[PDB]
């Protein structure tokens, strides 16, 4: 076959259209170069790029056979000489838009910012209807423009009340294989240290300092010392008590379970306390835990921690350690956190996700999530709600 | 917003259409439930499912605003009350069709067999234009019909001279993370044992037995013994000589390199010889080697191997060992081989790929590849040629 022909079928979807076209094409010397077919809301598009004999293409028979067969059953067809890209290039990036709701104005603002920077939209699809509306756009970004893109979509995100994430869509960068979660107000509801403090009747003081520290207004280590000192004199039994009171973030189990299906190494990195966390890590079958450790004398807390202290730099160090042991390059790691002491860890990771985060963190994170559902992380990792439900139904 | 409306835009693709529609929708109380957009060969389809106030939907203004805006620039739009699936379900399987060429008759036969078994085609796209034409169909298979489907497509594949593979498209099953290759006539061109035999002037005898063994006509262990005996009296220097003569299969480096990008554990399992293979495994930075071992006395081959012998069952055992060490469940493993002694290994693996294989193997493999390009394996693993070239250009 010495000449290229492009055949494009559109119209209202009907069964048997696909088979019919290639059966027709088989009466002409047709060999296939590319086929693309989708149906959206009962609208068929079928594009077929072929090679056929010059003799066949320069004759009305191929045309008449195709036009007759397709028009008969009620669709439209176009036929033209090509001689035209065979296969489209991969998208460079993907954009996730999550919201509850996603207004038309929000999405319209995303599409406008995209167009402004010369970014072509290659595909749009929904990735979730629950617990949040989620939409994916795969895009092609002009080289060097993707900084400008992230800045623009960040402005759009704050103004229009949706989450917007722009991620690299290349082969390696999207083979993410390792994830770490902060514990307090990320994997687990609330702040453990405040739960401990309440037992000393110091919930007020400690909560104040915690929120100061999580906004980046206080050095993490000094804030840890001031807060843990509050616990001086509590019996160590308080540790088990609080451990048994802990509630997982909504969507946490689904998140971990789905990540296990995908072969992720999973771990936690916390400035909190190991005796409280390790019990839970075991229950969640995690692969790695880094945390601080309470000092205990004669079955009583002293109000100090045992060095060395996992601080902001310590969390990045822990992630790096974990990924080295697991044999996972940093570019294929994910970190999820909510607070300013997570800043270094999020920056070290391939993908840093700020989850219901203080401004300090959301300001430097690759992506931010604002809804109280930890499983929206999965959407950022290329999973759809449909795929989660299917896998869970298969059990 | 208390009522659902579906808006469907089709026609010749133009810039700014997407932004325009949602800007229009924003003048009505519209919140988004699902957006699907593709462009194929300059044909746009944009389907938008929304919720809006009952008051707005029961009035001509929304309609007129949308119809005017879209028809003006030269596309078509439909608007209708929904009240309709929000997000489509995931496909159950994916079908790969590879050929050189892929005739219209071949693909037509695939589409017909698919339709016959009540299988719906959800998507078609090209995955490669080189070294082979490759097409992907994502499908939804009626429960219990996928055995019948594989049988039908196997008949089609032999008759029409294309490779056809049907794979499960679920979340876990497609997070493949570990792969093993047979060496001889899979990763490496030709048969090492025949190269060794030629040094003894026994290439003829050994080749005969090798091809008998690879077709499953001979017990592998006895055939190994008869063939290695042929080497009795060769100096062990022959091992290095043959090791330096080895040529990788076309596409081997691309295959391994791409699998490394994706975070695969990679290994080889062979009935061949460790002193010949380990040198190469090191060069290819593989994670695991299992092989047999030549007996050497006083720097001379004795013509025997040192037990235990990696036989047909041994290869499955090796794969299982490798996956256990790597922490990879069998369902997420891949095995590639060409011969009958690979039968147990292919059956144990999540995905068993027969590569230019003897009938005995191709008969029980999940998928078969008939072209002399090892990188066509990558297509079966969900990678496109475009993505390989992009990653390689990024270096
Ligand atoms: Mg926290
Ligand atoms: Mg072999």
Curated annotation (Swiss-Prot), chains A, B:
Keywords: Amino-acid biosynthesis, Hydrolase, Magnesium, Metal-binding, Serine biosynthesis. Its cofactor is Mg(2+). It is an enzyme of class 3 (hydrolase). Pathway: Amino-acid biosynthesis; L-serine biosynthesis; L-serine from 3-phospho-D-glycerate: step 3/3. The active site is at residues 182, 184. It catalyses: O-phospho-L-serine + H2O = L-serine + phosphate; O-phospho-D-serine + H2O = D-serine + phosphate. Its EC number is 3.1.3.3. Residues 6-83 form the ACT domain. Pfam families: ACT_6, ACT_PSP_2, HAD. InterPro entries: ACT-like_dom_sf, ACT_dom, HAD-like_SerB, HAD-like_sf, HAD_sf, PSP, PSP_ACT. Mg(2+) binds at residues 182, 184, 338. Substrate binds at residues 191, 227, 270-271, 315, 341. GO terms for cellular component: cytoplasm. GO terms for molecular function: L-phosphoserine phosphatase activity; magnesium ion binding. Gene3D superfamilies: 3.30.70.260, HAD superfamily/HAD-like. GO terms for biological process: L-serine biosynthetic process. Binds 1 Mg(2+) ion per subunit. It comes from the Bacteria. Belongs to the HAD-like hydrolase superfamily. SerB family. Catalyzes the dephosphorylation of phosphoserine (P-Ser). Homodimer. NCBIfam families: HAD-SF-IB (TIGR01488), serB (TIGR00338). This is Phosphoserine phosphatase. It comes from Mycobacterium avium (strain 104).
């Amino acid at each position: 076959p010495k000449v290229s022909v492009l055949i494009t079928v559109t119209g209202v979807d009907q069964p048997g259209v696909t088979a019919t076209l290639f059966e027709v094409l088989s009466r002409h010397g047709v060999e296939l170069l590319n086929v693309e077919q989708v149906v959206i809301r009962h609208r068929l598009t079928l594009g077929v790029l072929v090679c056929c004999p010059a003799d066949v293409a320069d004759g009305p028979a191929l045309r008449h056979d195709v036009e007759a067969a397709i028009r008969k059953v009620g669709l439209d067809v176009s036929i033209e000489r090509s001689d035209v890209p065979i296969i489209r290039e991969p998208s460079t990036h993907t954009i996730f838009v999550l919201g509850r709701p996603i207004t038309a104005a929000a999405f319209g603002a995303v599409a406008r910012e995209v167009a402004a920077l010369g970014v072509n939209i290659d595909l749009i699809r929904g990735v979730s209807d629950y617990p949040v509306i989620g939409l994916e756009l795969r895009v092609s970004v002009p080289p060097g423009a993707d900084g400008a893109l992230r800045t623009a979509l960040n402005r759009v995100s704050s103004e229009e009340h949706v989450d917007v994430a722009v991620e690299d869509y290349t082969l390696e960068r999207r083979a993410k294989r390792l994830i770490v979660f902060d514990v307090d107000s990320t994997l687990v509801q609330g702040e453990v240290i405040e739960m401990l403090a309440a037992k000393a009747g110091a919930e007020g003081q400690v909560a104040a300092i915690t929120d100061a520290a999580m906004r980046g207004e206080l050095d993490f280590a000094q804030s840890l010392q001031q807060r843990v000192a509050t616990l001086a004199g509590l019996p160590a039994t308080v540790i088990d008590e609080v451990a048994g009171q802990l509630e997982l973030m909504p969507g946490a189990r689904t998140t971990l379970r789905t990540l296990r299906r995908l072969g992720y190494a999973c771990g936690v990195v916390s400035g909190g306390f190991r005796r409280i966390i390790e019990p839970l890590a075991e229950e969640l079958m995690l692969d790695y835990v880094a945390a601080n450790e309470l000092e205990i004398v004669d079955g009583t807390l002293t109000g100090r921690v045992v060095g060395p202290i996992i601080d902001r730099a310590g969390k990045a160090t822990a992630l790096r350690e974990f990924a080295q042991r697991a044999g996972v390059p940093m570019a294929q790691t994910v970190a999820v956190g909510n607070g300013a002491n997570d800043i270094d860890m999020l920056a070290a990771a391939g993908l840093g996700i700020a989850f219901n985060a203080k401004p300090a963190l959301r300001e430097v994170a690759d992506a931010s999530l604002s809804h109280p559902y930890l499983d929206t992380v999965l959407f950022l990792l290329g999973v759809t709600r449909g795929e989660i439900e299917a896998a869970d139904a298969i059990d």
